[PDB]
Swiss-Prot record:
This is Neutrophil cytosol factor 1. The modification Phosphoserine is found at residues 144-145, 161, 169. The lineage of its organism: Eukaryota, Metazoa, Chordata, Craniata, Vertebrata. It comes from Homo sapiens. The chain holds residues 157 to 336 of 390 of the full protein. Residues 150-159 have a biased composition (Basic residues). Component of the phagocyte NADPH oxidase complex composed of an obligatory core heterodimer formed by the membrane proteins CYBA and CYBB and the cytosolic regulatory subunits NCF1/p47-phox, NCF2/p67-phox, NCF4/p40-phox and the small GTPase RAC1 or RAC2. Part of a cytosolic complex composed at least by NCF1, NCF2 and NCF4. Interacts (via C-terminus) with NCF2 (via the C-terminal SH3 domain). Interacts with NCF4. Interacts with CYBB. Interacts (via the second SH3 domain) with CYBA; interaction is phosphorylation-dependent. Interacts with NOXA1. Interacts with ADAM15. Interacts with TRAF4. Subunit of the phagocyte NADPH oxidase complex that mediates the transfer of electrons from cytosolic NADPH to O2 to produce the superoxide anion (O2(-)). In the activated complex, electrons are first transferred from NADPH to flavin adenine dinucleotide (FAD) and subsequently transferred via two heme molecules to molecular oxygen, producing superoxide through an outer-sphere reaction. Residues 1-56, 67-126 form the SH3 domain. It comes from the Eukaryota.
Amino acid sequence: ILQTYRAIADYEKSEMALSTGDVVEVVEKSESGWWFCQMKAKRGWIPASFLEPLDSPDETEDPEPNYAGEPYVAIKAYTAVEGDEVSLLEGEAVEVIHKLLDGWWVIRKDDVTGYFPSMYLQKSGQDVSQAQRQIKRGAPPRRSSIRNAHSIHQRSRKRLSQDAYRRNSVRFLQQRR
């Protein structure tokens, strides 16, 4: 594949500067002495909440809400920090109504709606141990936990308030119980 080389000195700007010790992958060697290279890609898991799409403030792949609800149970206890969050003890049953991609799902419990970490929930009637081993990291931080976020979009991201979620929830819910 691509050969890996190392910079033995600093090179100033060639849209890429070089710092001694830098590791690069050589894409094209040339007898001209100028080689086209790329820095080792920097990858990793990050909280979706800290990101915003470039083209628009709104996420394009969030699934649609389902007010009918899906039965889930808390597999890990969580204490609400903000008013729009739901506190649950392990074993408490809830109904998921919006599986948002930022990890904080809207759930319904006792006629009211609020957010809860998806990672701490599992469909009812399944192996709890299995869902717990799937937890290899804590709940991601919420966007509302960010102080002084900076956006490139003047318009705010579209997201129903908990009151709006509740009004839809009480009207279009489905109980098989």
